[PDB]
Amino acid sequence: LVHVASVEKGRSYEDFQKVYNAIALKLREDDEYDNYIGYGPVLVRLAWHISGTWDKHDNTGGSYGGTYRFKKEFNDPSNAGLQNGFKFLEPIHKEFPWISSGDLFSLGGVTAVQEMQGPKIPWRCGRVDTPEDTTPDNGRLPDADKDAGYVRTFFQRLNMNDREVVALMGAHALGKTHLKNSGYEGGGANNVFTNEFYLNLLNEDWKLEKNDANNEQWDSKSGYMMLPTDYSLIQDPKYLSIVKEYANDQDKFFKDFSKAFEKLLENGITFPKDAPSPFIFKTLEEQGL
């Protein structure tokens, strides 16, 4: 199964920076969402979940087809709460009806990471909407109540190795869990992209507790939390080495996250030899906007 990137007809970097800017300006404007976290974190989660359905074995799922717009995927229990991201992006899609759904969902994640002071993430256009029958079945996204071996095996399906997995997980610096979406309780409000996930893992005094949904999670006296799968990164000695690396080198973390996240967002897509190079969008701040 081959999905060839096809540039939206006549579009170039200027067109996609306008979309980026629209997203970024709305991220600034809609600041109250989720007790003033804003929409940045849920857009990152959205970009991940629309990509994380990919299966390297048969090239089903992935970001290319924009299949999250279909009920079966929109209603995946693993996607609970992402409707807020979809609703945020609707007026963007209305203004720029030419951009494909996959392009919009993935670009929203890139925009969010960058506007939250994250690394620059190169981004390629050309995802094409595919029909409803291409929507992957539920159950391809990962469970949060398992161990390092599960995480490692899970991510093999997405062609991610240990460093890619650990880097990608650093997005859990952002936002929080919501009991009504996932059964995990969190109390953070972070919407600045940093390596603090790794620092918190290593520095806090974690206690294994049960939350109000009767699920186990790791909690600290300071008020922080980790999912079982998060905590597994310090239980497994190979992941632990990488955690320590990123805790001690912000730039390395940014660089490896950027690479892994672009890869995640591009899995499944064949880019023609003469496709445009990846775009690196300027932030609002870099543009003086």
Ligand code: HEM
């Ligand atoms: C083993 C893999 C992972 C598991 C089990 C997992 C699980 C979770 C869960 C349970 C939530 C809470 C959802 C809610 O209650 O609203 C969450 C949120 C989040 N996840 Fe992950 N995740 C994984 C990997 C990732 C990856 C790879 C990224 C992106 C690079 C990502 C980005 C996020 C973000 C940004 C949020 C916060 C969303 C918000 O504040 O609304 N996660 N994840």
Ligand SMILES: Nc1ccnc2ccccc12
């Ligand atoms: N903010 C967070 C801290 C630790 N784990 C998380 C897991 C999912 C979302 C957010 C977090």
